[PDB]
Design a protein around this ligand. Structure first.
Ligand SMILES: CC(C)c1cc(C(C)C)c(S(=O)(=O)O)c(C(C)C)c1
Ligand SMILES: [Cl-]
Length: 134
C-alpha cells in the first residue's frame, strides 16, 4: 500500500525531446510517428490495492494498462506492437520493460520536484517527456 502515492493523479505533457528518434529506433513508421509525435497526452495513474492503472489519453490514441508490480502482462502499444511487459518499482522509479520480436525497450517514470519525468530508451536512444499536474 501507498507504493505509488506520488504518481497517482492526472498529468499533462509539457515537453518532449527526441521522441521521433526513439520511435524510429522502436520501428514506428512515418505516418504514425508524425501523428504520435504531435500528441499531447494526459497520463492518468491510479491505484486500487495491488493493481496500478496507467491511461494515456490524447487525440492520437487512448490507451490503458492495468498491472501488478513484477507480474508480466501482454500489452498492445499505441503503435500496435504486441509486447510482453513487466513493470517494477526500483528505488522509487517505475520501470517498464517491453519485449517483442527479440527487441526490448524500457520506460522509466519518476517524480522529480512537481514533475513526472518519463524516460524512454531503445538501445542508444533516449527520449525524455516531462509532465506536470493537470
Ligand atoms: C508510439 C509509441 C511508441 C508511444 C506512444 C505514446 C503516446 C503518444 C500514445 C506513448 S505515451 O502514451 O505518451 O507514454 C509512448 C510511451 C509509453 C513510450 C509510446
Ligand atoms: Cl520529442
Amino acid at each position: 500500500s501507498h507504493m505509488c502515492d506520488a504518481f497517482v493523479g492526472t498529468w499533462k505533457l509539457v515537453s518532449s525531446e527526441n521522441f521521433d528518434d526513439y520511435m524510429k529506433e522502436v520501428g514506428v513508421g512515418f505516418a504514425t510517428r508524425k501523428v504520435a509525435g504531435m500528441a499531447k497526452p494526459n497520463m492518468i495513474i491510479s491505484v486500487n490495492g495491488d493493481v496500478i492503472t496507467i491511461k494515456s489519453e490524447s487525440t492520437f490514441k487512448n490507451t490503458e494498462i492495468s498491472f501488478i508490480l513484477g507480474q508480466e502482462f501482454d500489452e498492445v502499444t499505441a503503435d500496435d506492437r504486441k509486447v510482453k511487459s513487466t513493470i517494477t518499482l526500483d528505488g522509487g522509479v517505475l520501470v517498464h520493460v517491453q519485449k517483442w520480436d527479440g527487441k526490448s525497450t524500457t520506460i522509466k517514470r519518476k517524480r522529480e520536484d512537481d514533475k513526472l519525468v518519463v524516460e524512454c530508451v531503445m538501445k542508444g536512444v533516449t527520449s525524455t517527456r516531462v509532465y506536470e499536474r493537470a
